[PDB]
């Protein structure tokens, strides 16, 4: 499923992401834009045999288990398949753990590169939340 | 790929100070952590001090807390280890490591978390 911007904003708001660990809702929408282009089925293979899964490109070495990744830690205690669902809930709940790790949203490279320090509110503007 | 190059090192008196430097080059944009490891004679490599480059947050092994300081110059892709109040037990080969993955803090002092390594530099406490 490919979310619309305001569709995803409303879903993320319902999941309690607004100001989660200090990050306003626009940060989360922007992150999903640049991580996955709002595509819940996005995947990216890495050179360590891990794969990044879903709308927030969560990694299979550290966070979810896909059964094929060397050195798997599964800190979110979930199958990576759950992160390719059309509803965002498993991704969100694992993202809540990631963003709480100690370095905020810097975990997301696309967020660092294209969202951090920008007018992130623009991503929720017009959505009538 | 990322190349890491150490400078500094050598002999130092107990109680004294040395500074090590690590310069990264190559695909440096994606560097997440720069971290110092060491390996003392007859022992396994251990993580000493890790720095998360996008926040400046630092993580230390217990045996060096308060004495060693890791810092950076992010704009120059540099990491530094200032070793103050050195002890006998600090004699070791010190190696710079880096990774381009966003390793959980709890694994930031484990060597298997790292993808890129320098050459090692000897520090000897007399
Ligand atoms: Cl931040
Ligand atoms: Cl916002
Ligand atoms: Cl060279
Ligand atoms: Cl070493």
Residue numbers in the entry:
A (entry chain B): 1 to 129
B (entry chain A): 1 to 126
What does the paper say about this structure?
Among them, miniature single-domain antibodies derived from the variable region of the heavy chain-only antibodies of camelids have gained relevance due to their high therapeutic potential and the robust techniques employed to generate them. The usefulness of VHHs relies on their ability to specifically recognize antigens with high affinity despite their small size. The kinetic parameters of the interaction between the VHH antibody termed D3-L11 and its antigen HEL were determined by surface plasmon resonance (SPR) analysis at 25 °C. The values of the association rate constant (kon = 6.1 ± 1.6 × 106 M−1 s−1) and dissociation rate constant (koff = 7.9 ± 1.7 × 10−4 s−1) were determined as described in the methods section, resulting in a dissociation constant in the sub-nanomolar range (KD = 0.13 ± 0.04 nM).
The large loss of affinity of Y102A (~2,300-fold) with respect to WT prompted a more detailed structural analysis by X-ray crystallography. The complex Y102A·HEL was determined at 1.50 Å and 1.55 Å resolution, respectively. Except for the presence of a molecule of cryoprotectant (glycerol) filling up the vacancy of the side-chain of Tyr102, no other significant differences with respect to WT antibody were observed, such as in the conformation of the neighboring residues of Ala102, or in residues contributing to the affinity (Glu32, Tyr52, His54, Thr55, Pro104, Arg106 and Phe107). Similarly, the shape complementarity remained high as shown by the little change in the Sc parameter (Sc = 0.76). Although the mutation Y102A considerably impaired the binding affinity for the antigen, the conformation of the antibody-antigen interface remained largely unaffected. The removal of the aromatic side-chain of Tyr52 or Tyr102 resulted in large losses of change of free energy with respect to the WT antibody. Importantly, the meager affinity between HEL and the mutated antibodies was caused by a significant loss in the change of enthalpy with respect to wild type antibody. In Y52A and Y102A the loss of enthalpy with respect to WT antibody was 6.0 ± 1.4 kcal mol−1, and 5.0 ± 3.2 kcal mol−1, respectively. The loss of enthalpy was not compensated by a favorable change of entropy of similar magnitude, leading to weaker binding.
